[PDB]
Each structure stands twice: as C-alpha cells, then as structure tokens.
C-alpha cells in the first residue's frame with residue numbers, strides 16, 4: 001500500500017537551493033525500485049529530474065547540470081531533493097515518484113525575489129439594482145505574495161454557489177477573485193462575509209459585503 | 213532527449229463516445245532488453261498523474277478496461293472505448309527506454325455538453341480600494357459552455373484594450389461548465405473621470421454581445 005508524501009518550502013529566492021523531502025510509507029526504499037523526483041512546469045509539461053536507486057546510487061537528468069543531488073535517510077524511509085542555484089525556470093510542482101504508478105500529491109514551489117506580502121481584501125457589491133431572485137456578490141483579494149490564499153464564504157456554510165478563480169500576476173503580486181450567488185431573499189437582509197486566509201503572512205481577514 | 217509528440221493537443225468528447233490519442237517518438241522505443249517502455253498517464257485537474265497503461269498495452273490494475281494502448285517502434289495509441297466524466301483531464305505518454313526518460317507534452321480532454329449561457333455580473337470598485345489610488349472593475353461570467361468567449365470592456369462607449377486581466381476556471385466536475393472573471397484595473401483618478409463602465413461578452417449562446425453595465429453616478 002505504497003504512499004509518497006512531499007514537503008518543504010512554498011517559496012525560494014533566486015540563486016538559493018531548494019530542498020524537499022519525500023516521506024515514503026508502505027514500502028522500504030532500500031528493498032527495491034528507484035525513487036524519483038519529477039516536476040511539472042506551468043503549462044503542464046513534465047520533466048524527470050533524477051532518482052536514487054535502492055542500492056543508494058543516483059542518476060540525474062543531464063539538463064540539471066551538477067546542480068541536483070538526491071539523498072536518503074533509510075531510517076526514516078525518506079529521500080530528499082536538493083536543487084541549487086535556482087531560477088524562475090524552476091518554478092513548478094514537484095512530485096516524488098516510483099515505477100508501478102505511484103506519485104505523491106505534489107508540492108508547489110515558486111522561485112522569486114519578491115517579498116511575502118499580505119493581501120488587501122475588497123468587497124464586490126452590485127451597483128443600483130435588478131429584480132432577480134438570485135444575487136451575485138464577491139471578494140477581490142489583491143496584492144499578496146506568495147500563493148496560496150483560501151477564500152470561504154460565511155465560514156464555509158455557503159459552499160453551494162461559489163466560484164474562486166485562479167490567481168493572476170499583477171504588478172509582481174497576486175490578485176484573485178471569488179463570487180458567491182445567493183437568494184436575494186437572504187441578502188442584504190442577512191450578512192454575507194468573505195473569509196480570506198493568507199498563511200504565508202499569518203493573516204485572516206473577514207470582509208462583510210454591505211449594500212451600496 | 214527522445215522527443216515525444218502527442219496528437220491532438222486538445223480534444224472535446226461527449227460522454228459515451230470514444231476517443232483516441234496518438235504519441236510519436238523521435239526514435240524507436242525498443243530497449244536492448246527487448247521490451248518497449250512506453251506508458252500512458254492521466255492527470256485529473258488539481259491531482260497527481262495516474263498510470264493507465266504500461267509496456268505499450270498492459271492495463272494498470274487500478275484502471276478500467278475502457279482504456280487500451282497499442283503501437284510499436286515510434287507510433288503509439290491510446291483509445292478510450294467509451295468516455296466517462298471522470299476521464300476529464302490531461303493525458304501524457306512517457307518513455308523509459310532511453311536516458312533521460314521523457315514525457316510527451318500532454319493532450320487535454322474536455323467533456324462536451326450542451327451549450328450554456330453565462331450568468332454575467334458587473335461590480336464597481338469598492339471605496340476601500342479607491343483609497344489605495346487604484347480601481348478594479350470586476351465582471352463575472354459564470355457556468356458557461358463552450359469555453360470560447362470574448363470579453364470586451366467599454367468606458368463611455370469606447371473599447372478599453374489595456375488594464376484587463378482574465379482568469380478562467382478549469383472545467384467543472386459536476387456540470388461541465390466553465391466560469392471566468394475579467395478585471396479592468398484603472399487608477400482612481402482615471403476611474404473618476406468617466407461615467408459608464410460595461411463588460412460585453414461574445415459567446416455562441418447569443419446573437420448579440422451579452423452586456424452588463426453601471427454608471428458611476430449613483
């Protein structure tokens with residue numbers, strides 16, 4: 001019942017090294033197979049980076065100079081990636097993997113010199129009126145870094161009619177939006193609040209969506 | 213590296229219909245040990261790659277037999293007898309015969325469904341934002357199909373090309389629609405010089421642009 005679990009930093013500065021850990025369970029990394037690091041770039045293309053063999057030898061893609069090493073801790077059943085001199089081109093989702101169709105959940109890594117920055121949170125309330133039985137409200141979350149942010153609505157009791165859009169770059173920081181659609185019978189007569197969490201900056205913001 | 217080229221690049225298929233995807237290698241995938249190390253994988257939105265087929269035509273035991281692989285040498289094919297909703301995602305080929313192992317660039321399968329008109333909403337900048345010196349006008353275009361849509365902004369009757377950022381969701385797993393947000397960002401002083409802001413969507417579900425608007429005067 002083989003499982004693979006990657007962990008390590010969200011954000012690395014250019015030129016520095018990136019180190020990740022893959023924690024393997026349900027199979028001993030000394031008992032067989034090669035144990036691989038792969039990565040997926042924005043745009044979905046996949047590259048194999050290297051492996052550590054059960055004997056402990058290593059083989060690396062020519063495309064990663066000698067700036068990649070893989071090591072292991074056979075006592076904890078973990079193997080490790082280290083990629084040095086990183087650049088914007090190494091920004092990616094990193095996956096540990098084994099033959100037989102086993103992949104980790106993946107871990108996303110951005111490489112930037114931009115600083116961790118907490119979000120502003122703006123409410124989206126409609127202008128001066130329409131008849132209809134449903135209303136759409138939203139939140140605009142702007143100028144935070146790095147990914148991710150979470151958005152919930154009224155602490156998650158509103159999940160049904162929600163769309164939270166992928167973040168886009170905007171002046172070297174991220175901006176996302178989310179919309180929620182509720183019965184006009186319930187807003188504005190009841191409160192709708194967007195809850196925004198930005199873990200990198202240790203921030204939670206609640207914004208109430210008020211009419212006009 | 214051995215180049216792996218997949219065709220087509222995107223494909224739209226109705227649930228219950230078949231599909232086919234081809235993978236071509238820059239040289240033969242036969243290894244000196246006599247086996248041909250070619251696999252097919254699926255990656256569903258926001259998940260890891262999963263193995264479908266290995267050694268050209270062997271079915272992974274976790275995968276249903278609606279998936280089959282064939283081919284030899286440099287030419288390979290994945291077929292899906294009958295497409296299900298769960299087959300939404302990106303398919304990749306992979307070779308592990310030559311060093312370094314390589315992956316093809318991926319083929320995106322979307323589920324074809326009935327045309328659906330977007331629900332379009334427009335929002336004025338908040339006063340909060342205006343205190344930062346910036347202004348963002350937000351337009352939501354929710355639960356539509358097909359994906360192709362053109363969104364145009366006008367200010368007092370004229371098209372505003374710049375300052376617009378769009379974000380699209382991946383295809384929805386429950387209803388197979390797409391949604392999009394479009395944001396027009398201006399400076400506050402520019403925002404405060406004009407009265408009429410409009411988001412116009414061109415989409416095959418209407419013979420005219422779908423329009424939402426507001427006037428700064430109120």
Ligand SMILES: Nc1ccc(S(=O)(=O)Nc2nccs2)cc1
Nearest residue numbers: 036097098099100101102251263
């Ligand atoms: N690095 C790596 C590349 C592909 C795969 S697989 O999921 O296709 N399973 C495979 N099984 C046999 C060969 S590949 C696993 C790890």
Ligand SMILES: [Ca+2]
Nearest residue numbers: 243308309310
């Ligand atoms: Ca070989």
